[PDB]
Structure formats: C-alpha cells, structure tokens
Nucleic acid binder design. Structure first.
Ligand SMILES: [Mg+2]
Ligand SMILES: [Mg+2]
Ligand SMILES: [Mg+2]
Ligand SMILES: [Mg+2]
Ligand SMILES: [Mg+2]
Ligand SMILES: [Mg+2]
Ligand SMILES: [Mg+2]
Ligand SMILES: [Mg+2]
Ligand SMILES: [Mg+2]
Ligand SMILES: [Mg+2]
Ligand SMILES: [Mg+2]
Ligand SMILES: [Mg+2]
Ligand SMILES: [Mg+2]
Lengths: 137, 150, 117, 101, 112, 59
RNA sequence: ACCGUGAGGGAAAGGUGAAAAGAACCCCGGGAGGGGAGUGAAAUAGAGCCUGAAACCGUGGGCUUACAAGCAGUCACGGCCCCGCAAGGGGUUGUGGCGUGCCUAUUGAAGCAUGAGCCGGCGACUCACGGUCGUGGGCGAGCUUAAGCCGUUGAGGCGG
RNA sequence: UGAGGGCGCGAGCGAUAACGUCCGCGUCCGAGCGCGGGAACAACCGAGACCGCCAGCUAAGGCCCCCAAGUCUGGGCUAA
RNA sequence: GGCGGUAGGGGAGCGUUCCCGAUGCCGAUGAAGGCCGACCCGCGAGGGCGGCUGGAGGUAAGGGAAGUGCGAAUGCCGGC
C-alpha cells in the first residue's frame, strides 16, 4: 500500500524580499506551503510550512505595474468595484501586496485558508523573534 | 355493472382525464384480458393414441410389470375376496397397480383400494397406465385391445 | 388462474433500501428516489475505480519530484537516466523509498546522473 | 532487508515475514513457488539491468477463492440502458518464505 | 424499576403536548408538578391526570415511594384522528385533522 | 387555489430548524413567605393569603 | 348510507379467542384511558381484538456539525463508536480527487419542453377462427375428421 | 426507419451577414450527454469503454502555483 | 480473433398463480408471510443459511396452463 505518516512536525522559514521579483518569488512560497518539497507530501492533512517574509515595501515587479496594475474589491452596492492600484497599497497596506497573490496560487477548498494562515508577510523588517528563523534563500 | 358516463370533464378539471368506471385503469371496473371460458380440447389423430396405446403396454411387458388373468377367487363382490387373491398372485401393497376387467364385481372388490384404481376394458387412458407402477388386465380386455390392434 | 403481485414488488424495494443506507433523507427511504442515486453511484464508482490510479499515479510523481529536487535535479531529468539504465522496475509507487530508507533511493539518483552528462 | 518482487503484472515491496494477495497462477494450492524475478536489497543492491542477476525470493501459497464480490452495474442515462453485474477477483493467499539464492 | 401509564386517545394534537412533555423530562417529580400546575397551556392538565397517575401506580401497584422518584422518560405518539370537513369557499370542502394523542410517562428511582 | 406558493415540499431539518425557537421557558416561581408552597413572584398563593391583603379560602 | 327535484348515479366496510372463560376486585382520575391482580396455551390475542410491511410522527443511544458554497453521491486516507482471532468487519465523516437528478418527446439537453409530494395495492399483446413460415411428433399415395351414437363419470371407442 | 443535426469542403439563395436555409462528398452526435485537452462547452482534437488491479507505453494537448510534467539548453524578437 | 450501444432481431434464464406428479411428502420439535445479517451459491433476475415474529398450511426433480415481474400515464383506491 501507500505511505502516509501520522504525526508531522512542521518547520518555519525566513525569507526576504528586497529586489526579489514579485510573482516568481511568491510562486515558490505556495509550493513551500503545499509541502510538495516534502517527499512525505500529504494531499489533505495540511503539512504546510510557515513562511515569515520580513520586509516588502521594497518589493519591485517587472515593468511599470507600480503605476499600471490595479486590484479590485467589490462591496455589493453599485459603484462598489473599488479599483485600487499597486502603488497606493505599497504605501499604507504593503502587506497585502503578496497575500492577494499567494491566495491566487493556493488551491480552492477550505484547506487554502488554512495554508494561507501558516504564513505572515510583515514589512519592517526584523519580525517578532519567535524562535527558529530558517532563512532559505 | 357501473354505468357509461364520464366521471368529470377533462377540460378545466385539475385532475387527469377519465371516462366510464369500467376502465381497467381504475379499480373494480373491468378486467383487462381476463380468461373468459373456453374449451381446451382438440382432435389428436387416432394413429397417435392407437400406437400410443400399444407403446405403453409393452413398456410394462418390457419390464415384466404385466399380467393377464382369467382365474379369480374373487369373481364375486368383496374387498376381502380379492386381497387374498392378490396374496396368492403377487401384489403385496408395495407398488401401485392398474386393473382392467369386464366384471363389475371385482371392481367393487377393489374400488376402495387406494393403490388400485378401477378401469373398464375400454378407456385404457395412457395417463392411468403410466400413472400406476404396474398393470393387470383380462382376456375380456385382450379381445378389444386386440380388436383395436392385435 | 389469477396471479396477483404480492411478494414480488415489495422485496425489490427493500433491496434498493438495502443499498441506500446512509443516504440523506428521502434518498434512502423513498423507493423511487433510492433507485436514482444508485444509478449515479454505480456510474460514479465505475469511473473512479478507473480514476484511483491516476490519482495515485499523480501523487507518487510529486513525492518522487519532491525527492529528486532534494538532491538537486528535476523529475524529468531523474527518470531519463533510470530509463537510460533500462530499469523497468520503478513502479512509480515503489519509488516511495523516501521514508522507506533513503540511501536505497538516494543512490538511485546518482545512477541517473551517469548516462546523460 | 528490502525484498521487491514482480508478479501478475504488478510489483510490490516485501519485508520477509507475512502474507500477501496476488493473482493466481497455474499451480496446485498447496506448494511453494519461486520468483527469481527480484529487485534490490535492504543493504542497497541496485539493479542496472531490470531483472536482477539470478537472485530469488521463495513464497508459500495457501488456497484460492475470492475476497469481495463488487457489483459493477452500468447504467447509461436517458437510454433505458441499465446493467446489473458483479464478479469475484480470485487471488493467491501468498506467504513469502525466504529471499535465498 | 420504572413505572408507566398511558392516557390513550386524547383529543389534542401531538405538536402541542410535545412542547409540554419536553419540560418535565429529567426534572424531579416535585418540580415537575410545580412546573405543570403553573404552565399556562392546555396539555399541562392532561399530563397531570397521567403523571400523578403514573406516579400513583408507582405506589399502588409497583411498591415504590413517591418521596423519591424522578421523571425517568416521557414521550407521546400519534393516534388516529377524526376527520371533519371545512366549508372553505365557492363550494370547496377541505377536510380537517383533529388530532388525538398518546401521552406516555415513566418514572424511576433517585437513589437507594 | 391562489397566489405565492411553496415550490418544493419543505424538508425535515428545514421544517425542524425553524422550530428551535419554540421550546417553552419553564415557569419561574418562588416559595410563599409563610406556606411551604411554590408560587409566582409578586403574587398571592391559592391557599394562604398575606398579611395586608387577604385571600384566605376554606376547607 | 351519500348525491340529484328528477329519472339516475352508487360506494366503504369480513377476521379476538376453540370455548366470553371478556377483566370481579383494588388504585390514579370527572369520566375516558391506563397500573395491578385474575381467566386464558398465549392479553407481546383486549372488543375495528389473525398476520402487520411502507410512507408519516416521537423517545433513547453511537458518529458529526456554528470558516462554509452543496443532484447531496463515488474514490482515498485518517478520525470516533461498536463486532471480531491474527489479520479483518460494521456504522459515521473531516479533509483531498471527481461529480450537470429519473422517465417521455425531442437533432438537441443539467435545463426555462411532458409528467410525478410519498408510500402501498389494481393496471396494460391474452383468446376464437382462418392462413404464411419455422419447428416436434404420427402416417406415408395417401393423410384426416365434424356434428352426432355406446359407457365409468375427470375412460375412451365408433362416426369417412 | 422513412422530421434529423454538427463540422471541413464545392456550389445556389441571402447583403462575397446571419449559432439562416436547400443540395453533393465525407466525418461524427443521434445510438458514444461514457474518458482525456479545449476553464466550462453533443458532434473541435485524441481515442471505440466486457469486468478487476495503488502496474507500464502513449495521442491530442501540456511542463511556475490550483495543476501531474524543464522557471531545460542554444539562437533571435517586443516595452505594449 | 470479437464482445459501447437506441429503435429492432435471435438465444438463454430467474420469479409469481394454478394442475399432473399426491389416498405422496415437509409441518405443533412451528408452514406461508413479515423484521433483520458483515454468511454461502449465481455475473444475473434469483436460490439456500443463523436469529426474531407469526400460528396452519406449503409442495421437490420432470411436464403443463397463465389474469404473471412496475417508477412515472396532471394513471385509480386508501393512508400519510
Ligand atoms: Mg359488477
Ligand atoms: Mg370533458
Ligand atoms: Mg504513470
Ligand atoms: Mg524518496
Ligand atoms: Mg519474484
Ligand atoms: Mg466483482
Ligand atoms: Mg369503488
Ligand atoms: Mg498479517
Ligand atoms: Mg407503488
Ligand atoms: Mg474538458
Ligand atoms: Mg478492447
Ligand atoms: Mg508541478
Ligand atoms: Mg399460496
């Protein structure tokens, strides 16, 4: 039969994002959540690792997206399609410039908003020194 | 016995569409393709029963399960005046027997015999022959059975 | 000779109930509902018994891919060498020796980097 | 000691000392069959060739029959095509003895 | 030992008393009574003539003492129902289900 | 036969989940100043009376 | 009975027990209805009293559910409770994979085309005569009777 | 059975419109609403499903994540 | 070697009611029927087996006759 573990100890990861191209960076992050870097990968039990990406206001992306790409938020009322650009968020909410990208690569079921929990993206840097800080480059 | 009148108009009704209550779709009305009375007989060629009469008789001869008789301690009417005749002939209630004779006395002497069914010299029904496991008959038979075939 | 229905029509509805056990609400007690959802099952079970491999056929690969990229090479580059080694062995499941003693598999990797570079 | 083996169109990972289900083979249900078709070794014995060089594994049978009859009813929607069918999938209550060679 | 008593055939719809029975369940008899005697409903009366009659025969026939027992289990089922028509309008005649009941109360033993 | 109309026979849970808000609050009560009786707040018990307002019944 | 002025239409409904031996009596209670005792082989045969299914209602218990998007199932794994001897099995489902109810007519469905609230019962190619083909058996330049007549009464024979 | 339909093509009608129609060849759906790509999508692409298996080769199509498979190698191209 | 399949064709089977098989046999040490089951035969429609209920009929192997197998018809009766 097939191998499945029982208990699983996770591991946390330290990652920076100075000069790191926006999307290609956050891409491996999703894979780094959905532990397919783990030969003991499990398609349901959520073994995802915890990525703590310090700093992000210094994130750059190809092209002129800083003045070209807009994100959309829809209340429900008319006139609700709020078109927010990649610049205004990179000023007062530079934290969700990555979030609403990984959720764009995490899967669709309920496990997604569990995987996405196992990850916080501050912009400082020097985050709350919890304990281990595995800086993978 | 129900009448022949529409139950309620089909136009503007809410329910379905219907008519008289003899309709088999209802209940208690009429039968569908019920079994009206009819004969089951036909006319099977005599040459099948003639030969069919012979075939079965030898079947008991081929197995020996036969006997022509002529002598009787029971030429009169008594069931006791027979079972001893069977004792002195060879019928010990083990297996069934058909009997033929032109005497209406011996029939009485066994008409109450569960394992011995009466039979007149004529209607040698192949049913009862194959029915009974052994056969008996007389010359009064073996002249008409001969005049049939013989 | 009349032959009413009687036993026949009931016992059958009991078998459908017999296979409709744990089906929500009417779907397991109402007969001609249970008849339905059984149709899909035997179809849903058909296709998926054809599918269960492709599920695991896929899963094994990712685990394998998880292993090779922990030596420093991709799955595409992994398999070829094995194939270059002509080893019809590796049932893509049996390459699960990443938590079933690794050197048994870790030294399957170096026997791949040979016949290609 | 890793005992791979390949029989009946599928292979398996055996550690020597318990039973197994594999498809039948033209054999008497009370004997012992050899699989010189073997792979690997728990002390690392890769096989450049597919089949190993002459090694083997010895297994003991037990009986035959079937596990579960699994219904296979095919029903095409719409078109009055329903089918009711099932079958038994026989096998060999196989017990593996040694990996001798 | 539990003691039981059913008041078969009681012209009151089940949906009504089930609201009432589901209140003395698990309560001690003393409170069960005080619960009932001040329960502004109608099923509360019918329980009384089946409760203190179920606690009765826990004494007059099943040698127990009233000073101890407790509402072990209590349920009610659905009997048949008289059918009455309701002249609705334009000549329609929609029948009506005047529902009876089958109130069932059993009582046990606290300790001892 | 008229206007809006249920479309599908409301299911069992459906019917029953509405009915959680229907279970009865059991009657609240206190004990009588004098009687060993059980009695509502701000009331006069159907046996005793009071001490500034009669009720006194009979045998 | 019921409907209709009227002709006329026209149902539903059997089953205690062999014997009423049918519950004296006691208790709750206004009674009805119940508890007990007792008859009875059996009251789990209580007077709509043989059998008692299904829809439908409720009480008790095992599993689950208040970050979740659903033809309500299928597949996989784990989890909870139970059965069991290794191993295995039952019931539930948390997560992941996939998943456009049934019949009918339609070129065409998931469908905004017909139909069904559900359950249980009645309900739909038989019969007569003649005829074509096939086949099984009988006789074979022949093959075969129909009405009818003798006879036991679920017997056949004559009758060309 | 004698109402068919889609697509590629050759015409007529139509406005060298119509997911419009009438023909011819062929294909397929109907009878393959059973599978895989085309997000979804009866006839576009592959491919005829007797059943089972936690086995391997492949077509279409695909290889950063949902989503299995090179952020593959070499050479150019474009700043929208 | 073939076995997707609608209208349609041929072949094969399971079930019900009744008759010959019966002045036979099974049945009070419990029949037909109804609740179950993870047991067994059959690919099947089905047939056997253990448990519970019920309380008096039921009928093998081979032949025969059918009022014969329900999921729908805004089908009918009744109940819900
Ligand atoms: Mg009549
Ligand atoms: Mg009319
Ligand atoms: Mg594969
Ligand atoms: Mg590995
Ligand atoms: Mg071997
Ligand atoms: Mg099977
Ligand atoms: Mg009637
Ligand atoms: Mg074992
Ligand atoms: Mg029905
Ligand atoms: Mg697709
Ligand atoms: Mg094939
Ligand atoms: Mg990938
Ligand atoms: Mg019968």
């Amino acid at each position: 039969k097939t191998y499945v573990p029982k208990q699983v100890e996770p591991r946390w990861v330290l990652i920076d994002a100075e000069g790191k191209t926006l999307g290609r960076l956050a891409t491996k992050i999703a894979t780094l959540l959905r532990g397919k870097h783990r030969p003991d990968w499990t398609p349901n039990v959520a073994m995802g690792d915890f990525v703590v990406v310090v700093n992000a206001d210094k994130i750059r992306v190809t092209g002129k997206k800083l003045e070209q790409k807009i994100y959309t938020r829809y209340s429900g009322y008319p006139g609700g399609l709020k078109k927010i650009p990649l610049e205004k968020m990179l000023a007062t909410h530079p934290e969700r410039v990555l979030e609403h990208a990984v959720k764009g690569m995490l899967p669709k079921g309920p496990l997604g908003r569990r995987l996405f929990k196992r990850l916080k993206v501050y912009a400082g840097p020097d985050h709350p020194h919890q304990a281990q800080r595995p800086e993978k480059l | 016995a129900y009448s022949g009148r529409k139950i309620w108009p089909q136009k503007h009704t809410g329910r379905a569409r219907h008519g008289d209550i003899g309709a088999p779709i209802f209940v208690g009305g009429g039968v569908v393709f019920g079994p009206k009375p009819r004969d089951y007989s036909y006319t099977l060629p005599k040459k099948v029963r003639k030969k069919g009469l012979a075939m079965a008789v030898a079947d008991r001869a081929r197995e020996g399960k036969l006997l022509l008789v002529e002598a009787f301690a029971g030429v009169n009417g008594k069931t006791k005046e027979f079972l001893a005749w069977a004792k002195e002939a060879g019928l010990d209630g083990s297996e069934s027997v058909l009997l033929v004779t032109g005497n209406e006395l011996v029939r009485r002497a066994a008409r109450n015999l569960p394992w011995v069914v009466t039979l007149a010299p004529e209607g040698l029904n192949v049913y009862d022959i194959v029915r009974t496991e052994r056969l008996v008959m007389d010359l009064d038979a073996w002249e008409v059975f001969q005049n049939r075939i013989g | 000779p009349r032959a009413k229905t009687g036993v026949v029509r009931r016992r059958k509805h009991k078998k459908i109930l017999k296979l409709a056990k744990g089906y929500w609400g009417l779907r397991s007690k109402s007969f001609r509902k249970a008849r339905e959802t059984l149709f899909a099952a035997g179809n849903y079970a058909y296709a998926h018994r054809k599918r269960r491999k492709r599920d695991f056929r896929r899963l094994w690969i990712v685990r394998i891919n998880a292993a090779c990229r922990q030596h420093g090479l991709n799955y595409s580059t992994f398999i070829h060498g094995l194939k270059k080694a002509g080893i019809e062995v590796d049932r893509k499941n049996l390459a699960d020796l990443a938590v079933r003693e690794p050197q048994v598999f870790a030294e399957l990797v170096e026997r791949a980097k040979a016949a290609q570079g | 000691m890793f005992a791979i083996v390949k029989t009946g169109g599928k292979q398996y990972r055996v550690e020597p000392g318990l039973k197994l289900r594999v498809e039948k083979l033209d054999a008497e249900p009370g004997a012992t069959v050899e699989l010189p078709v073997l792979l690997l070794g728990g002390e690392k014995t890769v096989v450049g060739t597919p089949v190993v060089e002459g090694a083997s594994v010895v297994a003991e049978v037990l009986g035959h029959g079937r596990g579960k009859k699994i219904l296979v009813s095919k029903f095409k929607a719409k078109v009055q095509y329903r089918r009711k069918k099932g079958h038994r999938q026989p096998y060999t209550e196989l017990l593996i003895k040694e990996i001798r060679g | 030992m539990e003691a039981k008593a059913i008041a078969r055939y009681v012209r009151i719809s089940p949906r009504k008393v089930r609201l009432v029975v589901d209140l003395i369940r698990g309560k001690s008899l003393e409170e069960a009574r005080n619960i009932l005697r001040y329960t502004n409903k109608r099923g509360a009366y019918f329980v009384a003539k089946v409760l203190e009659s179920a606690a009765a025969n826990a004494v007059n026939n099943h040698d127990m003492l009233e000073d101890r027992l407790y509402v072990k289990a209590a349920y009610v089922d659905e009997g048949p129902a008289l059918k009455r028509v309701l002249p609705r309008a334009r000549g329609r005649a929609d029948i009506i289900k005047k529902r009876t009941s089958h109130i069932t109360v059993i009582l046990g033993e606290k300790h001892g | 036969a008229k206007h809006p109309v249920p479309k599908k026979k409301t299911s069992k849970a459906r019917r029953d989940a509405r009915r959680s808000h229907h279970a009865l609050t059991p009657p609240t009560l206190v004990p009588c100043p004098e009687c060993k009786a059980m009695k509502p707040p701000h009331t006069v018990c159907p046996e005793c009376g009071y001490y500034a307002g009669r009720k006194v019944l009979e045998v």
